[PDB]
Design a protein around this ligand. Structure first.
Ligand code: MG
Length: 54
């Protein structure tokens, strides 16, 4: 069963690597979208405050 053990252990590692890559990709995409929304809200806040000082 040696060949079986090698294939299964490598397959486990491949699954873990796939999960690690998927989580990295999702984290980057989430960071991008969060930065967009946060910048939008900061621009809105700054514009509102500039509109209030006048
Ligand atoms: Mg790993």
């Amino acid at each position: 069963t040696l060949n079986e053990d090698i294939f299964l252990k490598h397959l486990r590692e491949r699954i873990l690597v796939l999960f690690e890559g998927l989580n990295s990709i999702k984290k980057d995409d989430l960071e991008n979208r969060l930065n967009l929304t946060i910048n939008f809200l900061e621009f809105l806040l700054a514009n509102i405050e500039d509109k209030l000082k006048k």
